[PDB]
Design a protein around this ligand. Structure first.
Ligand SMILES: [NH3+]NC(=O)[C@H](NC(=O)CCCCc1ccccc1)c1nn[nH]n1
Ligand SMILES: [Cl-]
Ligand code: NI
Ligand SMILES: [Zn+2]
Length: 329
């Protein structure tokens, strides 16, 4: 069996290997990459997403989110407080201001220590799930605005057309901005390109051990757990690597830098934080291997779910028994 220890694997495709997205995802899985839940892909030197990032300051962040934490340093939740709209130029200035700028640090490890020591005592501002793309039209390889849609994948695999579209999202980050433990909607894959700026550190649990994380989360957030059988779908809960290790949860970590892709795999729980001002782009996608995960994916019905885009048709076709009551929610 490939990658039995579920290590995060890093791939360096040639320009020839970078032409067929589906084929390369399949290749990575043939080497066991999905067992980790997360893989890094470094594009060939000949490739670029766009020519320059000099003209992005006028993008609007319509609803910046101030991430206020409650709890303890290693076990906390965050609430996303809506702020006034601002441009990316204004956001970048704010991220670099004395209140929000990255502190001095020796290396990624030192910054990671500072993050988990001090995160809860600050409330950074985050731009999330902004429909849009920064890939040049003329970028033909791994352009997250030109992948095959999930609706087309479901039709190809299962035979029925469904409504819906599948478009990419932009994310604007600063130091300590945080993404809570989650899998993707309907346990889809995701792919994330870091366009510009400072790194993003990721934590991931192997899909085969995902239920171990869920059990710990129920123990650590018992009120939330009584309110919803799938409360990690709310995307507000954080657990530190130290607490995961204390509780024997298998996980791995890796830092993504500008110009690098990360792929998350079906039912791979992940969480992480940004090191400083950056801009990323991401989209969910599917493969034939996703179908059985979509059939089994947990759903939140309590009204608290954070869902990036409409999964109704996926639930309707893949989970007909659930459809009705999931829809009541
Ligand atoms: N799949 N997505 C990810 O892995 C990361 N983004 C998120 O999870 C979005 C977190 C927003 C959650 C939220 C917002 C408002 C109210 C409640 C919860 C990401 N961040 N940067 N790149 N990816
Ligand atoms: Cl700090
Ligand atoms: Ni994600
Ligand atoms: Zn819920």
């Amino acid at each position: 069996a490939q990658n039995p220890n579920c290590n995060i694997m890093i791939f360096h495709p040639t320009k020839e290997e970078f032409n067929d997205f589906d084929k390369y995802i399949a290749y990575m899985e043939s080497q066991g990459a999905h067992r980790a839940g997360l893989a890094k892909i470094i594009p060939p030197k000949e490739w670029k997403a766009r020519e320059t990032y000099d003209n992005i300051s006028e993008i609007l962040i319509a609803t910046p989110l101030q991430q206020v934490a409650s709890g303890r340093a290693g076990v906390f939740t965050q609430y996303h407080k809506k702020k006034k709209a601002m441009t990316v130029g204004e956001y970048r200035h704010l991220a670099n201001s004395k209140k929000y700028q990255t502190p001095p640090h020796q290396n990624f490890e030192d910054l990671e220590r500072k993050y988990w020591k001090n995160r809860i005592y600050n409330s950074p501002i985050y731009g999330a799930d902004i429909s849009g793309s920064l890939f040049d039209e003329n970028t033909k390889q791994w352009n997250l605005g030109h992948l095959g849609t999930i609706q087309d994948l479901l039709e190809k695999e299962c035979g029925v057309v469904i409504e819906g579209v599948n478009t990419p999202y932009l994310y604007f980050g600063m130091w300590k901005t945080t993404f809570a433990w989650h899998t993707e909607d309907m346990d889809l894959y995701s792919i994330n390109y870091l366009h510009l700026g400072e790194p993003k550190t990721w934590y991931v649990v192997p899909p085969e051990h995902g239920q171990r994380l869920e059990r710990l989360a129920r123990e650590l957030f018992p009120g939330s757990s009584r309110g919803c059988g799938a409360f990690l779908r709310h995307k507000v809960a954080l657990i530190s690597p130290t607490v995961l290790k204390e509780n024997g949860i298998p996980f791995n970590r890796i830092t993504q830098e500008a110009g690098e892709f990360m792929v998350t795999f079906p039912y791979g729980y992940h969480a992480g934080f940004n090191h400083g001002f950056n801009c990323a782009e991401a989209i969910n996608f599917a493969t034939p291997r996703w179908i059985d995960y979509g059939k089994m994916a947990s759903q939140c019905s309590c009204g608290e779910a954070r869902v990036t885009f409409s999964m109704d048709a996926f639930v309707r076709i893949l989970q007909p028994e659930r459809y009705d009551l999931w829809k009541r929610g």
